[PDB]
Each structure stands twice: as structure tokens, then as C-alpha cells.
Design a protein around this nucleic acid. Structure first.
Length: 175
RNA sequence: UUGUU
């Protein structure tokens, strides 16, 4: 597939980029390797992990299947751990999710879904509830794209006041 | 009691 950067743990601290390139190129064409380093004192030192960027997702997956939880590198007591790098995380849910405040305590997950469905696809919707299942009068709504979240905000923030609520509905990005 | 993942 398209290019992807993988995070790899349980790499010997003594290994350099050259050693890693050789390992990974068995599975696919590597774009570039970056050993994570600690420069807190002299000399800089490997943190025992690296980033490897493959040209294709297919290559990354094949390396993962071959290595992750499978191959134990020299001196290690645990096998390679391999997963997409944090830098590759894209639609963080955190930046797609709305806090909805000042909703009626009678409001159901379905009610909220229905109120906010016109603005996009809702991947998740949860009413916050206390111990006795009583609504805390708020919800989280996750859209699939933050863009749909921003649109719901503009349209729905303080647009109405619901039953029993002291102020209009609150619609904003969640903490 | 405006209650946040």
C-alpha cells in the first residue's frame, strides 16, 4: 500500500541503522531507518527501538507478520514488537469527539444520535451516567471526521434548551 | 448545581 512508518521495540542497543536496514529489507523495500536516541549525556545512545518507514503498507505488514512476537534479536529476552508509529496516527478520536452538555437527563443514546445525525456519520455516542444509571446530563459524540464535528458545533451549540436544564445545550470539542 | 473521555 502507501508508505508507512513503523515503531519497533526490543532492538538491541548495539544495533545501528545499517543492521536494521538489512533485517527489514528481507521483507520489503525500506525508505529510511531512524534509531531513537537518548542525548541526556555523552555519548548519545540507542533507546533500543527504531522507526522503519516502508514504501508500501504491504511490505510493512509482511515484516510485521514475520517479526512481531516472532523473532528474538541477539541478546534480547523478548521478541520484536512492531506497530504503526505514533506519528502516523491520523484521525485521533480525541480530535473528532464532542462533549455535549446541558442535555435532558431523559435523553437516550438514540435521542442524541438522532439530533446530531444530520451533520455526519456518528462512530460512537455515549451518555455519561452515574451509579444508578441516572444521566449526568451530558454525552460524548464521535464523528468520523472532525470536519463534521466542527459543523455540528456551529449548528447546535446553545441552539436550544432541553427539559430540566438551566442553560442552553453545550456543544464543543471534548477534553 | 456546568455535568468532560
Amino acid at each position: 500500500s502507501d508508505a508507512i512508518k513503523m515503531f519497533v521495540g526490543q532492538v538491541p542497543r548495539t544495533w545501528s541503522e545499517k543492521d536494521l536496514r538489512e533485517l527489514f529489507e528481507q521483507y520489503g523495500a525500506v525508505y529510511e531507518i531512524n534509531v531513537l536516541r537518548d542525548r541526556s549525556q555523552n555519548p548519545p545512545q540507542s533507546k533500543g527501538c527504531c522507526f522503519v518507514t516502508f514504501y508500501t503498507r504491504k511490505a510493512a505488514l509482511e515484516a510485521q507478520n514475520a517479526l512481531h512476537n516472532m523473532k528474538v534479536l541477539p541478546g534480547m529476552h523478548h521478541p520484536i514488537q512492531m506497530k504503526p508509529a505514533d506519528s502516523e496516527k491520523n484521525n485521533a478520536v480525541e480530535d473528532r469527539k464532542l462533549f455535549i452538555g446541558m442535555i435532558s437527563k431523559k435523553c437516550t443514546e438514540n435521542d442524541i444520535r438522532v439530533m446530531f445525525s444530520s451533520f455526519g456519520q456518528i462512530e460512537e455516542c455515549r451518555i455519561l451516567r452515574g451509579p444508578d444509571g441516572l444521566s449526568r446530563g451530558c454525552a460524548f459524540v464521535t464523528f468520523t471526521t472532525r470536519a463534521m464535528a466542527q459543523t455540528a458545533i456551529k449548528a447546535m451549540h446553545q441552539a436550544q434548551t432541553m427539559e430540566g436544564c438551566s442553560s442552553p445545550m453545550v456543544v464543543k470539542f471534548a477534553d
